[PDB]
Amino acid sequence: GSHSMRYFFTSVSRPGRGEPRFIAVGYVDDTQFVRFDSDAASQRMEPRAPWIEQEGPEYWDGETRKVKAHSQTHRVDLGTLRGYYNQSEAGSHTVQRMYGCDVGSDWRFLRGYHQYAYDGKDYIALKEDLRSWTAADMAAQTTKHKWEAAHVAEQLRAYLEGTCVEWLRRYLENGKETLQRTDAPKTHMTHHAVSDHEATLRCWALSFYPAEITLTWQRDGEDQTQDTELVETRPAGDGTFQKWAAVVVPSGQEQRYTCHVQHEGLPKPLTLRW
Amino acid sequence: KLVVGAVGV
Amino acid sequence: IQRTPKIQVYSRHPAENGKSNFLNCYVSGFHPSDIEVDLLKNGERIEKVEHSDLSFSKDWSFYLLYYTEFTPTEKDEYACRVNHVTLSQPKIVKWDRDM
Ligand code: NA
Ligand code: NA
Ligand code: NA
Ligand code: NA
């Protein structure tokens, strides 16, 4: 299957006193491996997976230096963006940045990305060609001109096709016991009767990794979306994920309905029946 | 590993 | 922009009375990031609740997991209480045991 390395940065201005909140998180696939929090005691990039603790002091010094550089750019950006949008010093505003690379099953480069948002809206994004920019509005267009003049796309393309995929491959190897392991969903059905004429069947998928999963209902072997509820996939808190899908059925007709579970960890999809 | 630099908007 | 949090309250493992477990409150789809999340035992705020590092989805909306160790019983009621700029009143979601 495909793999990804992604970094997520959140920047929140705190008008009244002092510096903005800065939070950085790094993931391989659906596994957090590093964090930085401006408000934490260490003022260091910190490990959040055992396989990254394999990295020497030089790694933690380098990642701490780079994440502090990211933090200072975001601090300046909050000021720049307040200027571009003619906003007062009084309001809290949010910057978000996400960048990273996807590799296929062969661990070769598939795609790179670098997306930036201001107050929860698209600002500027690197296009799939890693050579050009999507600017949402005229403030972002000013940034696009600046980044074109400074050859930012060329710098990011070199990282995304190079260091990003090289270090993703290193992490996948070092963390192979967990990162290269698929955890198939543990599945069961439950039954809930609201009235004498209506019952709800719930199809559960527990303790799976990675998070990507498809739960579908059929009635007499045909797909049914009517009278179904699918919850957002949610973290168990132990690194695995959970999901359920529910269908409302006439009391006594439970046997017509089947739940279908697709997951990377399953050689063939599972079928459950009440 | 993080990218080395971040150019301001 | 303002987006109101989605809330799921659930246990890590299928619950049995007297068996140590983890109570989760997963808050997602919200903006901006400032949010207040408490886990309640019989309406009283649980101390020393931990939470994940702030991250976000493709649409830029934030998600957090708040969690604590708990031992479920027959009588004890658990819930998640969420305040956010999008809510005129705190939202309380009761733990259902079969989510
Ligand atoms: Na930190
Ligand atoms: Na810190
Ligand atoms: Na934002
Ligand atoms: Na920037």
Contact A228, A246 (CB under 8 A): yes
**Same structural domain for residues A50 and A119?**
yes
Cα gap A231→C9, rounded to integer Å: 12
Domain residue spans of chain C: 1-99
Q: List chain A residues with CB under 8 Å of C53.
A: 23, 25, 32, 35, 37, 48
Nearest chain A alpha carbon to C13? A236
Strands (E), C1-99: 6-11, 21-30, 36-41, 44-45, 50-51, 55-56, 62-70, 78-83, 91-94
Last residue of a domain, one of A150, A181, A212: A181
Q: List chain A residues with CB under 8 Å of B2.
A: 7, 26, 63, 66-67, 70
Q: List chain C residues with CB under 8 Å of A120.
A: 1, 3, 31-32, 60-61
CA distance B9 to chain A (A): 5
**Same structural domain for residues A177 and A50?**
yes
B5 with A155: Cβ contact below 8 A: yes
DSSP, residue by residue, B1-9: ---S-----
Calculate the alpha carbon distances from C19 to A61, A166, A239, A254 in Å: 43, 44, 21, 32
Kind and range of the H or E element at A82? helix A57-84
**Same structural domain for residues A69 and A131?**
yes
Total domain count for chain A?
Answer: 2
**Same structural domain for residues A177 and A188?**
no
Contact C54, C69 (CB under 8 A): no
**Same structural domain for residues A57 and A41?**
yes
Cα gap C70→C11, rounded to integer Å: 9
Last residue of a domain, one of A181, A200, A222: A181
**Same structural domain for residues A187 and A177?**
no
CATH for C1-99 is 2.60.40.10
| CATH number of the domain enclosing A129 | 3.30.500.10
Cα gap A92→C53, rounded to integer Å: 20
Contact C50, C64 (CB under 8 A): no
Last residue of a domain, one of A140, A161, A181: A181
Strands (E), chain A: 3-12, 21-28, 31-37, 46-47, 94-103, 109-118, 121-126, 133-135, 186-193, 198-208, 214-219, 222-224, 228-230, 234-235, 241-250, 257-262, 270-273
Q: Which domain holds residue A2?
A: 1-181
Contact A109, A101 (CB under 8 A): yes
The distance from CA C74 to its chain's CA centroid, rounded to whole angstroms, is 20
Strands A31-37 and A109-118, how do they pair? unpaired
| Experimental approach | X-ray
Q: Residue A93: helix, strand or coil by DSSP?
A: coil
**Same structural domain for residues A176 and A186?**
no
The distance from CA A149 to its chain's CA centroid, rounded to whole angstroms, is 31
**Same structural domain for residues A80 and A151?**
yes
Strands (E), A58-185: 94-103, 109-118, 121-126, 133-135
Tell me the backbone φ, ψ of residue A138, rounded to 5 degrees: -75, -25
Q: Residue C43 carries which DSSP code?
A: T
CA distance A76 to chain B (A): 7
| CATH number of the domain enclosing A229 | 2.60.40.10
